[PDB]
Amino acid sequence: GIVEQCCTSICSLYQLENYCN
Amino acid sequence: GIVEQCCTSICSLYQLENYCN
Amino acid sequence: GIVEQCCTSICSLYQLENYCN
Amino acid sequence: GIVEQCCTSICSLYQLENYCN
Amino acid sequence: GIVEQCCTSICSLYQLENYCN
Amino acid sequence: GIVEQCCTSICSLYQLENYCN
Amino acid sequence: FVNQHLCGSHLVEALYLVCGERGFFYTPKT
Amino acid sequence: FVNQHLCGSHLVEALYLVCGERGFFYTPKT
Amino acid sequence: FVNQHLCGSHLVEALYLVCGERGFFYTPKT
Amino acid sequence: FVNQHLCGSHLVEALYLVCGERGFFYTPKT
Amino acid sequence: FVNQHLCGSHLVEALYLVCGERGFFYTPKT
Amino acid sequence: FVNQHLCGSHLVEALYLVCGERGFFYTPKT
Numbered sequence: 001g002i003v004e005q006c007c008t009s010i011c012s013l014y015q016l017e018n019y020c021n
Numbered sequence: 022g023i024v025e026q027c028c029t030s031i032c033s034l035y036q037l038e039n040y041c042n
Numbered sequence: 043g044i045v046e047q048c049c050t051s052i053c054s055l056y057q058l059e060n061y062c063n
Numbered sequence: 064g065i066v067e068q069c070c071t072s073i074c075s076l077y078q079l080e081n082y083c084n
Numbered sequence: 085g086i087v088e089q090c091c092t093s094i095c096s097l098y099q100l101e102n103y104c105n
Numbered sequence: 106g107i108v109e110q111c112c113t114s115i116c117s118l119y120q121l122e123n124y125c126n
Numbered sequence: 127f128v129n130q131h132l133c134g135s136h137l138v139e140a141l142y143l144v145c146g147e148r149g150f151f152y153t154p155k156t
Numbered sequence: 157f158v159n160q161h162l163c164g165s166h167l168v169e170a171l172y173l174v175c176g177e178r179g180f181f182y183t184p185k186t
Numbered sequence: 187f188v189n190q191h192l193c194g195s196h197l198v199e200a201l202y203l204v205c206g207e208r209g210f211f212y213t214p215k216t
Numbered sequence: 217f218v219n220q221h222l223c224g225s226h227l228v229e230a231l232y233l234v235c236g237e238r239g240f241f242y243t244p245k246t
Numbered sequence: 247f248v249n250q251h252l253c254g255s256h257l258v259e260a261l262y263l264v265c266g267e268r269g270f271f272y273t274p275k276t
Numbered sequence: 277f278v279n280q281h282l283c284g285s286h287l288v289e290a291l292y293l294v295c296g297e298r299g300f301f302y303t304p305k306t
Contacts (some may be wrong), residue, residue, distance in 0.1 A: 016270075019264045062180045115221045121291055124291065128193055132200075244262045
């Protein structure tokens with residue numbers, strides 16, 4: 001997932017990077 | 022109403038059309 | 043109109059009030 | 064504070080003015 | 085591209101669908 | 106200034122940090 | 127989490143997006 | 157820089173903010 | 187529903203709208 | 217008037233709105 | 247308080263902000 | 277295309293995002 005983990009209490013910078021292209 | 026029904030869990034496309042002008 | 047006059051350089055408070063319901 | 068009191072149920076106009084510069 | 089064609093004057097619905105997953 | 110330099114073509118990360126508290 | 131007073135500002139974004147060339151009446155009262 | 161079709165979504169944010177407990181009619185046509 | 191970290195980005199939108207020609211200090215700490 | 221770097225944040229809002237239950241790939245490069 | 251369907255439109259704003267010159271894949275499914 | 281009066285509401289979104297746990301002073305005057 002990507003939105004569930006972030007739309008709860010915000011994700012870490014390094015976590016978002018895994019979805020970056 | 023219009024905001025109460027939509028700000029809860031989002032409304033259907035056809036529901037919004039009733040408020041369109 | 044309403045958007046043309048406001049999306050240019052912002053409208054006055056009293057101007058928006060004319061569109062308020 | 065400023066965000067805690069406003070991100071709950073919105074603050075009053077006069078309250079925000081205290082943070083204005 | 086995707087942003088260049090849309091951030092100019094908005095894209096068509098069918099155009100955006102090509103980027104949908 | 107702060108908005109004039111950023112609302113034009115976006116500012117650098119280090120530039121924004123100067124306005125951070 | 128604020129309230130309708132700020133949540134509705136985004137409901138309208140999609141609302142007129144549906145209409146496109148049309149408009150709509152928004153009343154953040156109900 | 158898009159156009160009115162996306163600029164108006166933010167004009168409304170302030171529009172109903174002025175009204176608060178009131179509503180308003182928004183027509184992204186003119 | 188996120189949190190203050192994203193809710194405050196919209197509180198400021200109205201905050202400086204009130205000031206208009208003035209500014210304000212925003213601290214997403216409390 | 218900023219640039220694509222801030223304009224695209226709103227293009228995506230409508231982009232996934234179209235998909236709804238679907239997703240999409242966004243590249244603010246072109 | 248809406249839902250992910252409107253909350254994600256702002257998650258992406260920060261998402262591509264991190265990438266900057268890069269893109270990303272957004273799927274409002276999970 | 278509006279002006280700084282609406283463009284700055286999004287500059288701040290990224291501004292405090294950088295600070296995260298910190299705040300910042302925003303003056304839509306210059």
